Structure 1
Amino acid sequence: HMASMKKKGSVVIVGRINLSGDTAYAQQTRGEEGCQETSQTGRDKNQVEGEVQIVSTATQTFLATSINGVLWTVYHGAGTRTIASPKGPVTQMYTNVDKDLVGWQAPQGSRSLTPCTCGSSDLYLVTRHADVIPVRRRGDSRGSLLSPRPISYLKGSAGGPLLCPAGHAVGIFRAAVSTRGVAKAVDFIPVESLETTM
């Protein structure tokens, strides 16, 4: 019974959302078979680039965002999992189920978003398809969608950033306020909460 008992896989970086051009676009960097292998070994020799990663477990694909040298994502996606890296699986540096937040040391080669300092309530949610969706900040951790969307559209984008007009980080997207499967607002983890965790 115990020999049959295996550990859960690592989170695996399988792509990125490229935001450093004049265009936003998703890039896949690992296909399904590579992802499965890498989840088991915890050894990812790909060179990571950029700020927003697309990540997968065996059951979910979602996003992760580097801010202040830490790659952050949602606990409801990653749980307590290690992340695959060049030298093997990396244990989380931060874990907080109550905030729905986890983080690992940012991968070598990655870059971090700068926390927002401009005070803007005009926000932009970056999805896993590299859609840039306007969100009006309404409070510490909430913003309204200018256009309603099905919740299914936003599924898989938790862990991604809310950006201010200058492209600086305001928070990490985690959940949508929905009625009858239609999202009208988003819930996010503010960057100030990440700094408190650190």
Structure 2
Amino acid sequence: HMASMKKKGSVVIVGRINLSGDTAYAQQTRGEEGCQETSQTGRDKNQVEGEVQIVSTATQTFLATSINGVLWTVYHGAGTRTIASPKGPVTQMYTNVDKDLVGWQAPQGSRSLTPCTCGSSDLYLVTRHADVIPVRRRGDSRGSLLSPRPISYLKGSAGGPLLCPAGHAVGIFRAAVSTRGVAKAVDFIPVESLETTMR
């Protein structure tokens, strides 16, 4: 049994959500074959740019967001996996199954969002398809969608950011709250929880 035991691959950056300009849009930087190879080696020589990465395992594609020099995502997507990097696989710097949170050192080339200090409740969720959806904050870890969507619309957005009007990071999207397939609210990991994890 031992000789044939497999290893899980690395998480692989396969694109980004470009927020650098007037228009939000998803860009793909690696196709499926390159992703599969890179997951195996853990060696990714692609140049990273931006705050929000699109990331993949063998089974899921989701998001990861840089805040304070850490690339954050959800445990339910990444598990305990390494992330591929120019120098080989990079081990998680944070792992917290209870928070549904993991982090790696932010890749060179990435830009980080700053944690929000505004203490305000009018937010914006960035999805894996680069939609920017208004969300009213309803508690420390929940927000309501101003316009409800089918859950399919949010699938694969876990790990992406909720932002304040000034563009600071307020949280990391975790899960939709749904009834009969329709999302009217979102659960997120508040940035203060990340800040506690960091300090």
Q: Which moved more, 1:108-117 or 1:27-36?
A: 108-117
Alpha-carbon offset, residue 116 of structure 1: 1.2
Q: Distance in 1 between matches of 2:29 and 2:167?
A: 24
Gaps of 5+ in 1: none
Give the secondary-structure state (helix, strand or coil) at the position aligned to 1:3: helix
**Aligned mates of 1:113, 1:21 — CA distance in 2:** 15
Aligned partner of residue 140 in structure 2, secondary structure: coil
Shift of 1:102: 0.1
Cα deviation, 1:91-144, whole Å, max 9, x if unaligned, reads 000000000000000001111001112222110000001000010001100000
User: Where in structure 1 do 4 or more consecutive aligned residues deviate above 4 Å?
Assistant: none
Could you say which residue in structure 2 is the equivalent of 1:135? 135
1:163 is displaced (CA, Å) by 0.4
Q: Structure 1 residue 20: deviation in Å?
A: 1.1
| Deviation of 1:152 (Å) | 1.1
Structure 1, residues 18-40: CA drift from partner, whole Å, max 9, x if none?
A: 10101100000000000000000
> Structure 1 CA distance, aligned partners of 2:178 and 2:117?
30
Q: Deviations over 1:143-166 (max 9, x none)?
A: 000111111110100000000111
Cα drift, residue 3 of structure 1 = 1.5
* 2-structure distance, mates of 1:163, 1:24: 13
Q: C-alpha separation between the residues in 2 aligned to 1:181 and 1:98? A: 25
Following TM superposition, by how much is the alpha carbon of 1:167 offset from its aligned partner in structure 2, in angstroms?
A: 1.1
Give 1:48 shift.
Answer: 0.3
* SS in structure 2 at match of 1:192: helix
Query: Where does 1:162-173 land on structure 2 (aligned, <5 Å)?
Result: 162-173=162-173
What secondary structure does 1:92 align onto?
Answer: coil
Number of paired residues? 198
> TM-score, normalized by length of structure 1?
0.99
The residue matched to 1:88 in structure 2 has which SS?
coil
Question: Which blocks of at least 5 consecutive residues in structure 2 are unaligned?
Answer: none
Deviates more, 1:87-96 or 1:116-125: 116-125
Q: What is the root-mean-square deviation of aligned Cα atoms in Å? A: 0.6
Could you give the per-residue CA deviations for residues 52-97 of structure 1, whole angstroms, max 9, x where no partner exists?
Answer: 0000000000000000100000000000000000000000000000
Instruction: Determine the structure 1 residue equivalent to 2:117.
Output: 117
Structure 1 residue 6 displacement after superposition: 1.3
| Distance in 1, Cα, partners of 2:97 & 2:152 | 23
Distance in 2, matches of 1:111 and 1:3, equals: 41
Partners of 2:192 and 2:118 in 1: CA distance: 14
Distance 1:68 1:195 in 2: 9
- SS of the residue corresponding to residue 95 of structure 1 reads strand
1:65 corresponding residue in structure 2 = 65
> For the residues of structure 2 that align with 1:127 and 1:26, how far apart are their CA atoms?
9
